[PDB]
Structures are given as structure tokens and as C-alpha cells.
Amino acid sequence: DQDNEIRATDLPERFQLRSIPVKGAEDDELEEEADWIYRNAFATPTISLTIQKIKEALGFMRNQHFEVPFIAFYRKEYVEPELHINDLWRVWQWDEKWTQLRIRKENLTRLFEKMQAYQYEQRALDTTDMERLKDVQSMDELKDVYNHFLLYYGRDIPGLDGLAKKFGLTPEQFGENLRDSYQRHETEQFPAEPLELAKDYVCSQFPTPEAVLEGARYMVALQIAREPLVRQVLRQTFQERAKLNITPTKKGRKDVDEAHYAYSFKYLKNKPVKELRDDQFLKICLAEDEGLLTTDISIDTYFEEIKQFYYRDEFSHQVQEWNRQRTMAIERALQQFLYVQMAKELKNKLLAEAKEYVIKACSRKLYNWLRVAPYRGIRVLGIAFSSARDHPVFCALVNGEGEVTDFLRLPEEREKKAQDIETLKKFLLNKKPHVVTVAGENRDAQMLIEDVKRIVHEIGVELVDNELAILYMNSKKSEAEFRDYPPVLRQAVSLARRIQDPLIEFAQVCSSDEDILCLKFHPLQEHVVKEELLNALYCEFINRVNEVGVDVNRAIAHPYSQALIQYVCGLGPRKGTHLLKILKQNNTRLESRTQLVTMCHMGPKVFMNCAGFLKIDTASLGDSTDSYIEVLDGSRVHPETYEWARKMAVDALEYDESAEDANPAGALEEILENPERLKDLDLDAFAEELERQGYGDKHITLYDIRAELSCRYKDLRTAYRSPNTEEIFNMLTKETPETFYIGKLIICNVTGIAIGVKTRLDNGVTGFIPTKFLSDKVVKRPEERVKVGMTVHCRIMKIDIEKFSADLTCRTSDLM
């Protein structure tokens, strides 16, 4: 079984998963790799949205088998400051593209060699086999080289050419002229007119020698449109000078009006591709797929410029015929071969760029979710609810370790609310929770949080987003962990766990691709490729897991946290589960982290990759566990650098190197009691002396091995702030600032004249038609304008996000 060798091999689990297996480099193919990656992944795209660093990163990844986290987090001096974690991820992604292109090039080179052998057995390949195949810097021009090969040599797997050659300026020369923008190669006259040469070749397929002229022009057009140089020049022309024309289809004119997303570009005219926004072209292509819109990509001319080259000057009247034939051959080639294919290529590139922006937006949103810290374990009480109309509210007190301790149900109306408040206060007094979190669903969250505040002040109370809790509730894992609890109780535990630490909850509830895709990272998330979006999200998870480090001894004791050691560097689903299985079977919990290889069977390369990103809670151990404890194991420091720590501590204590009493362990076990002593050590002078001894540059590593001994796994996440009023508005309302289109038409229900007209929106937002339109402050009520109770649809003219109030319009003139 593949899983068996994957768990048994010595390479990172994520290295075997990739389709293109990681094969070593040569330092000459590696340099070409770096140049190609730098040129292609760091080139300006078509829509508005150091090489030694790439060389070092590629060398690490492909020869040292260092995962992107281990390069980012322990190889900074090699890649920084010009390469970061996401840059390393992009480099490793583009390595796959380089390998694919190289394999394609090798296959095509072998084909061209076999074809050369076959021809030698019998045009031919003299420098094209070298010039083209060797000079293939993209998959697109690889198609240009191959398809050009198929045009001529594709016939043989084991006479219109006469006219085409008698057409002047052989296609390679036409490509040269186009690339130079001037007639580098002159045309070749003939001592006759096209028809006379036509009589020679007009025999069976093309009688009526005009037909042989048509055939010859078609052959010339094929040869021109298949020429790699003409392909390059025309693709560049499309890239720089490309317009986007859009019109709505019969199905599109009617159903796209100020609310369909394609309204802003329902009609376009000469919209340059350079001005396409982040995801605008993705929306354009989605609208075109829906059949309510039609587009085309062109430059309008360019044909007039091109025709000047494949042409001759004199007016002999026997070259005007040749000139006209050449002009119309170029016309046909451009109109039916080059324009269409170049439009297809440009459309694919633009759509892929829009997809990439959408994926990046989803990744950034996930980053913001996972980069939100814990709160300041802690006993967290989580309150969750629903419409609340004949539906109770559940609050769950989740222990600091993350395990729910107990729950409480909180189901004329005034006395019932009073009794609920009394029982909630009783619960809070009995079991004091550090933080009370209220889920975010609607306006009722504000009232719930305010009541909780009124209770607590007689200890914080914070509103919490409710979107991962819903996914947890609907998931089967919630049923598995809590067979007795109702769904709303699952929401409370999810909210408490997320507030305690989002990463630990996001990884546990987003256990599969389907679960992660349930979340809403971006409106167009559903249209991007599933593989790329999933890879981006898992890369964000890996980054935040390695930048946090996963505490081993807690993932075992509390199996809720097991999901975190999937995203550890070096240590994957199979590898992580195998490590957990080994720990469980041995019935032993890591007193020490160099113990990984000692008690488990994980290879040198995996240990190197993973072990920097595993935490050991050395302050929590006691009883029989006191028997064996390596004190450095409680930190971000890794067992290749454990000698430099035990020198840095000795030097910071000014221990006499000549005293047999300089115990380097005891020096650390004094520095980890008094970390302020490490401030008196000159790390730059210490690093220069390590470099002189031949240990290499370690300046940045020593600053980490200091900052880490100053605080064991120093958390860098931004603290759990309370959401800004904008956050509350977009959370409880469940729509974004873009969704609140000032001037949007909304169906609202009128409730009652408190001097204005209170209209309740379906979005849970109060709508106040202004008295200006109402025209009655002390005058008779606005009943004449509209009857109270029913629903009307109007247009927004103002917003009150801090109060959940939005202006409306009564006049149809505003509606227009």
C-alpha cells in the first residue's frame, strides 16, 4: 500500500504526494530553474492586481528535502529578506511547472532526433531542433515549436509547396520581419505572374488555376501561423495591445439590470486587457458561460502594419498581383489562424490570473482567520442561538484545555427573561468563566451581549463570529463527539474552542477538502480550481501551524488537538497519524523531543524538517515523568543548533572556559531562570566567531535562539481584539460593504411610526425612511403615503452601521 512506504520513507510526506516526484538538481539545471522561476513567477501580469535566493531555495527543496516551512523558519539568511513563506510556496509550486516543461522538452527533443534520423534515411531540421527546443521558455511556445513540427513532419509516423516557396520571403523570414517591425528580408520576384505558375500545379484537386492560387495561399497562411517567431511576435502584440468587446445576448439584455454582477460591463467597447481588475475577467467569463453575454478579444489596424513587410514596391503590374496574393494570404492567416488562437490564449491567461487573484483573496481571508490569536488556559463560556422564536439558547462552559465541562439551557415574557437572567447569573457565579462569547447570527446577539454585560458587572464579554461553529454543528464529527447534545450546544462548544484558539478549531473542523470549502472565503470561491484553492488553504494552515508550533503532549492527552500535527513541516496525514499511533501504543508522552527518532522510527530528513515546530510543555510535567527531561526540548530551538545554545548560555554567564565546573546544561538552566542575562551578549560578535570557525553565517538563527529562551514559544499572532463596529455590522448582518450597495433596491417590511417610517429589512437591519420624503413631523401621519404592516421595496440612500439604520427612498424617481 502506498501509505505504507509513504509512512516508512525518509522524505516529507507532502513530497511523495506531488504528481511530479522531487528529483535532485545539478547546480546547472538548478540555476536555469531559478532563472526561469524568477522570470515567470515575478513578471508583470496582463491584468492589474535575487535569483540566488531562488537558487538556494530550490537547492534546499530538491536536494536537502527541506519543506517550505523549514526553509522559511530556519534558512532565513539564505532566502531573506527577498523571500518569505509565501514566496517559498510559490517557488515550490513553480518547480512543478519547470519540471513539466523540462520533461515535455526532453520528449520533443527525442522526437526531433528520431525525425532527423528518419529524414537522413530518406525540409529538414538543422538548427530548429537546437534553436527552438533548447530555447523554450514557456509551455505556450513549446506548443508553437511542436505544432510547427506537426505541420511539416507530422505526416510520417515511421505539390502546392511549389507555389508557397515561389511565394517570396519564406515563413521564417516573415517571422523575422514581424519581430523586427521592418522589412529585414526582401521579397523574391519571379519572371511571371501568379496564374502562369498556377497552370503548372492546377491538375486534379484544383482546376481553374485560381483554385491552385487559393490552395497555395492557404498553405502559406498555415506556414505563417505555425512559424514560432510569428507566434511569439503576435502573442506579444496581443499581450500589449488587446481590447475587450462585450455585448449582452438576448438572454442577457433582460436579466442583467443594476443587480446582476455583470451590470458594470454589460456593454464594453475597446476595454484594454491591461485595465482588467482583480477578478473582473473571471466574472466576465462566468457571465459568458451563463449565456447572457458575448465577448471577443482583438486589437482594433495591426494587419495594415504587417502587410507592409511581405510586400514589394515597384508598380510593374506583374508584382501587384503577387503583392495582392501575399497581402490576402497574410490576411487569411491572421483572420482565421493567428487571431483566434491568440484570443483563446489571452482569454485563458486572463481567466487564470483572475482565478489566481480569487485564490489569493481566499488565502488572505484564511490567513486573517488563523492569525487571530487566543484570548487573555482560560475557562470560556459560549452562548449560541438561532431565530429564537420558540427556540432556546445553549451556553457551554469549555475548560481551558478545550474540553467542555458543563452546559446550561436558557429557554408574561418579562418574568421568563428575568428567570433566565437569574439562572445565568447563578451559573456565572458558581463557575466563573474568564470570557463569555456570544455567537453572531442577527440583532439578537447585541441584546444577548448587553444582557450578559448587565449580569457580569455585578470578567469580559465579547461578541464572536458564528460561521465555523455552523459548519461544526452540521458536521458528522459534532455528532460523533457529542451524541447527547442538541445542535445548538455544538455551536457553543465550537465558539468557545475558537475563541480559546482559532487555529486549533479551524484545523479540527476543516478536516477535509469539502469541510474547508464549506466556508466562504470569497464570493467566486466556487469557480476557481478546487485543487489550487485547497492547496492555498492548506499552505496557509501549514504556515500558521509551523509559526505557532504544535504541542505534542497535549494532542495526545486531549485528542481534540490531533489535527494540528498534520500541518507540521516534514509530518503529513499518514506521518502524523503514524506518530500519534506510536505515541499511543507506547503509552508514553514526550518528556523530550530528540526522543522522536529515539522511540519512533522517523528518518533523519523528516526529524530535521518537523521537530523545530513541535512544542513540549516542560513546566506541566511531574510525578514519574521527572526521570528524563532535556530542557531545550521545551522551545522553537532544533537539535542541530543545541550546541550553539549551550555555548551562548555559557558565554552570557561569563563562565571561565578553564573551569571543569562549566556545565553547559546548568548554564542554560540558569539562563532559562534569568533570561535578561542574554541581553548583555553581543550576538553579532558571537556569530562572526562561529563564521570564522567554519560553521557558516548564523546571525539570524542566534537572534531566534535568544528570543525563544526569553519566552518559550513566544506567540506572534495579533491578540483577540474585539471586532470593530464594521466587523459587527458585516457579521451580524451577514453581508459585506459591497453588498450594501448605496442605492441598492431592497424589499423591506414596514413596522410602525415610532415621526418617521420604521421598515425592518430581511437582513435584520432597521430601515428609516426620512421625514423629508415622509413630509410629516408634526403634520398628519404618513398613512396616506403607505399603509402600515405590508412590505415595500425601495432604494438605500444612507447607512448607520453603528446603529443598523439605512436611509430609504419613497419616490419612484429615486427608483429610476
Binding site: 563562565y655 541581553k679 553579532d684 560578535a685 558571537f686 570557525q693
Partner: peptide
Amino acid sequence: KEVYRIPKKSQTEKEN
């Protein structure tokens, strides 16, 4: 004998 010490000669002021 063969010996080395990281020098406490540092002018960086104990990181405050």
C-alpha cells in the same frame, strides 16, 4: 589545552 568563550564584550544593552 583548546578553549573558546563567547565574549561578554557586547555593546547591545541587554535588550532593555
